């Protein structure tokens, strides 16, 4: 699992999501306080790892992107501040057994932002 932040995008209300990597291609995203299943994102292949990217939009609004990798090397990016819909699908140049993706240089799940304007 990985824990991340999500914005409601009709209120400016954030809440934590946990993201579980499942069997088929599935990522099950669910609320970190109530445990309610919010959405799910399925990639095509053997899901091996995933990471969370954030991008700011305006004052006090950001957008959460799930970045999930096949074993083969093809990467899906899901916008999940709306319904968990794909916005980009690209392919890793080379790479055949893919174990771990990570982002960095901004707020990851391991360098987390304490304040929403610091995302």
């Amino acid at each position: 699992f990985k824990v991340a932040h999500l914005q409601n995008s009709q209120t400016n209300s954030v809440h934590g999501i946990v993201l579980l990597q499942g069997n088929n291609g599935w990522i099950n995203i669910l609320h970190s306080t109530s445990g309610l299943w919010l959405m799910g994102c399925k990639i095509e292949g053997v899901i091996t790892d995933f990471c969370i990217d954030y991008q700011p939009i305006s004052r006090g609004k950001f957008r959460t992107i799930l970045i999930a990798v096949n074993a083969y090397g093809e990467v899906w990016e899901f916008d999940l501040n709306k319904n968990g819909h794909v916005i980009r699908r690209w392919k890793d140049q080379g790479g055949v057994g893919i174990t771990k993706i990570q982002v960095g240089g901004g707020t990851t799940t391991t360098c987390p932002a304490l304040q929403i304007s610091k995302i």
Partner: protein, 415 residues
């Protein structure tokens, strides 16, 4: 209007229409075999048996603009058949890039792409766009959520043109909607309890109807403006109307007609409304409406003849007693039949030949003997109706009206 009968050990699994604007209707159909069969609607015979050049056909679909024909075969092939050569003439075009498992259902996106659900639980996407670099090779593969304790088969695949999705029903009962570009799932519903054999949609793709062996018809709706701007189907409704199964479903929607038609293992047809499915009413047709009869009686001897597929049977009133039957197996298909007044000679007749049998009541049984006439043995018969005890009138399947035991002048009709 008409009925086109097939004979012993013949079935029909898929059939598609083709009407290029300005030309006649054309009706192709697969059976459980290696050929496609195109029928001319006049005679009620096959006018073409095109043997597709790879394996046993499992599904058939027609291109949008209807110049090409996909047949999806048991050895994993998808074969394109060039249809636009005129009614009757069918050419082989291209075998698409092969695979292992049999492709059980087909659909086209447009003239461009062809989607196919296979028996390994996957959904392939090939490009049938001629004069591209990737023509014929399979562009994408998607895998549905497999059953835990048995193999999964994707049974039904349609393309939804208003959005850009593929709807797919498989043998777990789950119905999935896939974004075509990015080739990936948007949302999965766990709708039925067993397989989803057939699913269809309306014109503007505000509804998707679906049905299978658990005999309920589910309706998935996207009619709200928020549903259309969010691309979110909801599992709207669910009806239980059929008795055993639903193996075929289709929809028609026009200015004075909006109905979905469904039928299955129980032999009856069911009509529902498209935009008023859950609310409105429905009509379960009778299992047979005998526009072409299979039973007639003769008042002398109080007897009645009745023919099912390739056998006739005769019984008398008294109670009742089965006096004779003719399971003629030199025959393969039956059609209409008539007895002589006085009950002497029976004549059975199909669109390929006809045959006449003298009958003699020998008591609690009959004796039946063929009487040879090669004109009858060569002629095609639709109707035989017995002018006299000897004279009959014959309507041929190629619009001939003979009088035997010779030719009625018949004027022509404005086309």
């Amino acid at each position: 209007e008409m009925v086109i009968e097939g004979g012993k050990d013949r079935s029909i699994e898929g059939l598609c229409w083709s009407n290029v604007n300005g030309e006649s209707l054309r009706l192709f159909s697969i059976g459980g075999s290696t050929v496609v069969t195109e029928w001319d609607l006049a005679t009620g015979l096959p006018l073409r048996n095109y043997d597709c050049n790879s394996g046993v056909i499992w599904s058939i679909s027609i291109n949008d603009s209807q110049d090409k024909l996909s047949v999806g075969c048991d050895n994993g092939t998808v074969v394109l058949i060039d249809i636009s050569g005129g009614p009757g003439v069918l050419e082989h075009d291209t075998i698409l890039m092969r695979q292992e498992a049999r492709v059980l259902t087909l659909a086209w996106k447009k003239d461009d792409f062809v989607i196919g659900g296979c028996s390994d639980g996957r959904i392939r996407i090939w490009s049938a766009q001629k004069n591209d670099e990737n023509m014929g090779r399979l562009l994408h593969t998607m895998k549905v959520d497999k059953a835990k304790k048995e193999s999964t088969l994707v049974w039904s695949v349609i393309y939804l043109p208003r959005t850009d999705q593929i709807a797919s029903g498989d043998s777990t009962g789950s119905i999935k909607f896939w974004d075509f570009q990015f080739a990936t799932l948007n949302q999965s519903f766990k709708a039925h309890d067993a397989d989803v054999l057939c699913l269809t949609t309306d014109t503007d793709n505000n509804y998707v109807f679906s049905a299978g062996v658990d005999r309920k018809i589910f309706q998935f709706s996207q009619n709200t403006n928020k549903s259309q701007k969010n691309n979110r189907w909801v599992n709207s409704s669910n009806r239980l109307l059929h008795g055993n199964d639903i193996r075929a479903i289709c929809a028609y929607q026009s200015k004075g007609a909006d109905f979905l038609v469904s039928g299955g293992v129980e032999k009856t047809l069911v009509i529902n409304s498209l935009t008023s499915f859950s609310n409105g009413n429905y009509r379960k047709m009778p299992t047979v409406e005998p526009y072409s009869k299979n039973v007639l009686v003769n008042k002398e001897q109080r007897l009645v003849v009745s023919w099912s597929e390739s056998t006739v049977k005769i019984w008398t009133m008294g109670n009742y007693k089965l006096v004779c039957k003719l399971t003629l197996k030199d025959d393969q298909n039956i059609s209409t039949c008539s007895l002589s007044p006085d009950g002497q000679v029976l004549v059975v007749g199909r669109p390929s030949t006809t045959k006449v049998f003298h009958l003699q009541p020998v008591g609690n049984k009959l004796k039946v003997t063929k009487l040879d006439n090669d004109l009858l043995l060569r002629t095609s018969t639709k109707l035989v109706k017995f002018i006299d005890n000897s004279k009959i009138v014959i309507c041929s399947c190629e619009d001939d009206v003979f009088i035997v035991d010779q030719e009625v002048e018949l004027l022509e009709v404005t086309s």
